[PDB]
Amino acid sequence: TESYDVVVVGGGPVGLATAWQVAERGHRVLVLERHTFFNENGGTSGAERHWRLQYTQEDLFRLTLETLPLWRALESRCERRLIHEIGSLWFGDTDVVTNEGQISGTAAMMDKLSVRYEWLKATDIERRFGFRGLPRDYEGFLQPDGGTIDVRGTLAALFTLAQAAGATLRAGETVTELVPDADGVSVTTDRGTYRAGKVVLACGPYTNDLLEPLGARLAYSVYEMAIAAYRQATPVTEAPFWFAFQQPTPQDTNLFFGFGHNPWAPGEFVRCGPDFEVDPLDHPSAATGVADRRQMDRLSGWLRDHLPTVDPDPVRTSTCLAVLPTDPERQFFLGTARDLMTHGEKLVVYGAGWAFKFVPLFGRICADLAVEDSTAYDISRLAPQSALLEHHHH
């Protein structure tokens, strides 16, 4: 049984960022990853992730401002620009309400927070970005500060920095049991056992598998989402991230999005996807890894009709797992398990969120809680929510 100050369960971006921060602070940290580092079987896949500035949720705007300096520090340390301002384009029917929100409502929130944007008409959208055949009443905005994030560059940086700082990184090892006590946590994996001062759970959609035996269950839902990669057919002029807000059809939500071009890449491929209603998985093992045929056909057909800048026959289709609070009013689960079980403060939990954009911040917060039990950042609205009735003594 090896002993560490902190054991991180999960070697995705949040786990690696936490380990880098813990090790740089001079504590002994071990990261246990069930598959391989850089795997694309959890919530981290593809080459890119979006970082918009526009939100109707005040807390997301605040987190965005607090994370930016942390991205800059990371970029400096690894000698790589990781965030690229390519723009965030939201267009279509400006009043339809979707899981992404509503154009008009969001534009009012930008007006209020003093976030700049340009309002565009269908003809401007087709001219500037290459879309074709849009209904002439479609409108929307371009928030120029919207960015795209180099996912592979970020993972490489975090892995290398964590390793250089002394973190012990082990792959192909699955954590199967956690038992906190007053003096630390006992960790069992399919390869051995460990003793930790505290454990950070950054295991994507698997958090409940380790909390269940301890009498806790968090209120999050897991979704397998389809994504398709397409070859760029015509050279880009402006290729921002885009989301098409439309009225639903009787069979689907009729929503589609594209991540935009990847500046660090040769400009050969881009990725897009449908944003259709998807029922939650009962457990992550239910994921198949095969993108839903009908959704891929709908997306490819829409791109054939409306965005001829890309060859609409996908080069590759795949899936990614989203892990989100079941309550749409909540954005993230980041905190300890202090209110969920005895000695719960010894388990630091990153349990749900649409969060690649906050990876440097979340890693710092998890490191703070792992070695101090407190962070200077406000995480009051991110408290992990129990899926069970409260019957325990507090």
Ligand X SMILES: *Cc1cc2c(cc1C)nc1c(=O)[nH]c(=O)nc-1n2C[C@H](O)[C@H](O)[C@H](O)COP(=O)(O)OP(=O)(O)OC[C@H]1O[C@@H](n2cnc3c(N)ncnc32)[C@H](O)[C@@H]1O
Ligand Y SMILES: O=C(O)c1ccccn1
Binding site for ligand Y (CB under 6 A): 50, 52, 100, 243, 257, 275, 354
Q: Would the annotation count 49 as a binding residue?
A: yes
Residue carrying structure tokens 């920095």: 161
In degrees, to the nearest 5, what angle opens at C-alpha 247 toward C-alphas 244 and 249?
110
314 binds ligand X (CB under 6 A): no
Binding-site size for ligand X (CB under 6 A) equals 34
Query: Rounded to an integer, what distance in angstroms lies between the CA atom of residue 241 and that of residue 261?
Result: 8
* Maximum separation of any 2 CA atoms in the chain, in Å: 67
Residue 353 found at the interface with ligand X (CB under 6 A) = yes
- CA–CA dist 290, 375 (Å, integer): 40
Q: How far is CA 361 from the centre of its chain?
A: 13
Residue 275 binds which of ligand Y, ligand X, none (CB < 5-8 A, kind-dependent): ligand Y
Q: Is 356 annotated as a binding residue?
A: yes
Say if residue 39 carries a ligand binding annotation.
yes
How far apart are the C-alpha atoms of 254 and 276, rounded to whole Å? 7
- H/E stretch holding 306 reads helix 293-306
Q: How far is the CB of 368 from ligand Y (least distance, A)?
A: 25
Q: Measured from the CB atom, is 71 or 91 closer to ligand X?
A: 71
Q: Strands 29-33 and 2-9: what pairing?
A: parallel
Annotated ligand binding at 343? The verdict is no
How is residue 41 written in tokens?
Answer: 């079987």
Question: What part of residues 149-178 is at the interface with ligand X (CB under 6 A)?
Answer: 174-175
Is 34 assigned a ligand-binding role in the annotation? yes
Residue 265 backbone phi and psi in degrees, to 5: -100, 170
Identified binder of ligand X from the candidate list 5, 6, 29, 42, rule CB under 6 A: 42
Interface map 190-229 toward ligand X (x if CB under 6 A): ------------xxx-x------------------x-x--
Of 121 and 264, CB closest to ligand X: 264
Q: Is 158 helix (H, G, I), strand (E, B) or coil?
A: helix
Q: Which is nearer to ligand X, 176 or 246 (CB)?
A: 176
**Using rule CB under 6 A, residue 292 touches ligand X:** no
Q: DSSP labels for 308-361?
A: TTB-SS-SEEEEEEEEEESSTT---EEEESTTTSTTGGGEEEEEE-S-GGGHHH
44 lies in the site for ligand X, by CB under 6 A: yes
351 binds ligand X (CB under 6 A): no
Q: Which two tokens stand for residue 287?
A: 């994921």
Q: Of 132-140, 292-300, 351-359, 363-371, which segment contacts ligand X by CB under 6 A?
A: 351-359
Q: Which element (helix H / strand E) includes 136?
A: none
In degrees, rounded to 5, the angle at the alpha carbon of residue 394 between the alpha carbons of residues 391 and 176 is 70
Burial status of residue 230 (CB atoms within 10 A of its CB: 0-12, 13-18, 19 or more): buried
Consult the annotation and say whether 64 binds a ligand: no
Which tokens is 161 given? 């920095």
Residue among 100 and 339 whose Cβ is closer to ligand Y: 100
175 binds, among ligand X, ligand Y, none (CB under 5 to 8 A by kind): ligand X
Binding at 199: pick from ligand Y, ligand X, none (beta carbon under 5-8 Å per type): none
Residue 255 C-beta: closest distance to ligand Y, Å: 9
Shortest reach from residue 259's CB to ligand X, in Å: 7
Tokens 């813990």 locate to: 22
Among 6, 14, 125, 307, binds ligand X (CB under 6 A): 14
Question: Site residues (CB under 6 A) for ligand X?
Answer: 9-15, 32-35, 39, 42-44, 49-50, 174-175, 202-204, 206, 225, 227, 320-322, 350, 353-357
Q: Which residues are annotated as a binding site for FAD?
A: 14, 33-34, 39, 43-44, 49-50, 175, 320, 353, 355-357
Binding residues: 14, 33-34, 39, 43-44, 49-50, 175, 320, 353, 355-357
